[PDB]
Amino acid sequence: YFQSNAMKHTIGILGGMGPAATADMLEKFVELRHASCDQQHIPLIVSSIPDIPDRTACLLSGGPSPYRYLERYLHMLEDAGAECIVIPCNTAHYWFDDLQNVAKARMISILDATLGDIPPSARHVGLLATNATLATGLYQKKALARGLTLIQPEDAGQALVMQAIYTLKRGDKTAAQALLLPQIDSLIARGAQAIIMGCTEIPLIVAGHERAIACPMIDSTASLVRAAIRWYESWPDT
Amino acid sequence: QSNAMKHTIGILGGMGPAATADMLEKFVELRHASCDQQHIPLIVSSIPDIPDRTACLLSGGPSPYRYLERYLHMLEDAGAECIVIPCNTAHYWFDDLQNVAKARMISILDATLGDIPPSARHVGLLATNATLATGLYQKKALARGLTLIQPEDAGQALVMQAIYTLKRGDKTAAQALLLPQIDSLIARGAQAIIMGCTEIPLIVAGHERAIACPMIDSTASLVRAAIRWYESWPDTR
Ligand SMILES: [Cl-]
Ligand SMILES: [F-]
Ligand SMILES: [K+]
Numbered sequence A: 001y002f003q004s005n006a007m008k009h010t011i012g013i014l015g016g017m018g019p020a021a022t023a024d025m026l027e028k029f030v031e032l033r034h035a036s037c038d039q040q041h042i043p044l045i046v047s048s049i050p051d052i053p054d055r056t057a058c059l060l061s062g063g064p065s066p067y068r069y070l071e072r073y074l075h076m077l078e079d080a081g082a083e084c085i086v087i088p089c090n091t092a093h094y095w096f097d098d099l100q101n102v103a104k105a106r107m108i109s110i111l112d113a114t115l116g117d118i119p120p121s122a123r124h125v126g127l128l129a130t131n132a133t134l135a136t137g138l139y140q141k142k143a144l145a146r147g148l149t150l151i152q153p154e155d156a157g158q159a160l161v162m163q164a165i166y167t168l169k170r171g172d173k174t175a176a177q178a179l180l181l182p183q184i185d186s187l188i189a190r191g192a193q194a195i196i197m198g199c200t201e202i203p204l205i206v207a208g209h210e211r212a213i214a215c216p217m218i219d220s221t222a223s224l225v226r227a228a229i230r231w232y233e234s235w236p237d238t
Numbered sequence B: 001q002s003n004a005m006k007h008t009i010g011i012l013g014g015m016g017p018a019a020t021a022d023m024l025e026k027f028v029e030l031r032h033a034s035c036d037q038q039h040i041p042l043i044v045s046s047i048p049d050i051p052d053r054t055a056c057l058l059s060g061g062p063s064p065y066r067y068l069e070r071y072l073h074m075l076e077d078a079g080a081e082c083i084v085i086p087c088n089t090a091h092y093w094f095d096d097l098q099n100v101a102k103a104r105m106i107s108i109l110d111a112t113l114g115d116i117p118p119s120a121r122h123v124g125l126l127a128t129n130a131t132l133a134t135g136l137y138q139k140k141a142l143a144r145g146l147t148l149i150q151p152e153d154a155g156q157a158l159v160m161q162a163i164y165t166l167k168r169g170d171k172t173a174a175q176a177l178l179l180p181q182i183d184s185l186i187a188r189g190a191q192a193i194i195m196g197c198t199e200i201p202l203i204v205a206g207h208e209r210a211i212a213c214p215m216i217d218s219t220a221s222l223v224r225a226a227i228r229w230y231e232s233w234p235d236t237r
């Protein structure tokens, strides 16, 4: 399988962070790839092994590091024949450069993909993300380089965004939506021209309410999927 | 700790991709978990170059067996200790795969039939032309005392069309094709209807209220069976 999977430009999804976001990524690979039939869709191998330690607990509360888990499942995907690896978790990109160095497969960053899909006129941009993604500034250096100004929720509001994410991770979308939606309105009221959904649970909470939201919402999961499809479609046989 | 020690489940999917994503969705929804880390360890093969199953069985098209075998071994080598296949037609090859498999395998057919209420003796069957033609459900249904109701030829062409319309990405058109066939099976006396092709639950999704009889979800039945397998180990919760 390995050599023919590699010849076929198989994409590996390093997911499980969390599992609903990984399932959402798979749906988006189906929705965003033009295919005449089953056989024209993207070849995908998915790691949805969610025992990976909590990313914010590690970065902000001294919890066990997820790195060695990420490294192990990365190598599992490569050994299965993945030639490109994508990670449907923003906070995990704290370790992106580390994983890239040990990877033989190509890796595509969710951060670059997401920032690249912001309309050029949107210069003041809200950011919905986990505490650790904000605190370690994962989007900060890259946003500054593109001439963007990020707006994040205040301390009280950011606690509610974190609650929404973990309520989604617990399986209660309706509760998560009631928590998140006033924070989206607050970001707009403070002048967000666009809002980055910079945690891959956020698209799952917003889904069905984009019409009720004044400004565009940038879907980091979809941005990464689109980038991976462009990689897949750039080969001479594709 | 190796994936085999952790009782990792391998999903041999890509048949088709949307149905495989649906199975992942259902693994989340059907497993009681308080956080990311309590969910089922899963490795997924969604490599869809597997040749068309009905084309093989009914027209002599290229066989999917060598692809299924290859991706099976890929999943075992990655650490899957149990394998589930979210495709009913592919279970034509279930015994062959189980012969060469080191991991446990759980049939979508047995799981689905086990989730039929015992009072439903007359059961509609929505499936591909090849699943019907090769009788994948017939002997197991006969053992349980069930009578299968399948659409007549004209209706079945429309069921097959709905499945392939969903596989092309048009859920709205697939529903327009499928829903009259569901009413027909009910009008003919179905007491439950097996969604015996894993694209059927995606077409029906959001309309079970308007349907007068229970719809038996083969994908969900398989997920529930795999979760029970995972939860039965002494060192799992
Ligand atoms: Cl073959
Ligand atoms: F994320
Ligand atoms: K599509």
Ligand SMILES: [K+]
Binding pocket: A017, A018, A021, A088, A089, A090, A091, A199, A200, A201
């Ligand atoms: K996430």
Ligand SMILES: [K+]
Binding pocket: A171, B028, B029, B030, B031, B032, B033
């Ligand atoms: K659940």
Ligand SMILES: [K+]
Binding pocket: B015, B016, B019, B086, B087, B088, B089, B197, B198, B199
């Ligand atoms: K199927």
